[PDB]
């Protein structure tokens, strides 16, 4: 848990550093793709287990 948790932090860190670089427009191309696959593994990671029906 604490590692999926760093692992979002690290890839969120990554994420501030580009937006702050590449302040010329593309912060939101980053933020808008980027954020989706950070919840995206998030909502994967937290509900992977949760007694999930083998679909």
Do not use: F, G, W, Y
Not at 10 to 18: A, Q
Not at 36 to 44: F, P, V
């Amino acid at each position: 848990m604490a590692s999926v948790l760093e692992e979002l932090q690290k890839d969120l860190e990554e994420v501030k550093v580009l937006l702050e670089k590449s302040t010329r427009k593309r912060l939101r191309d980053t933020l808008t793709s980027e954020k989706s696959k950070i919840e995206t593994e998030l909502k994967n990671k937290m509900q992977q287990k949760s007694q999930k029906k083998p679909e």
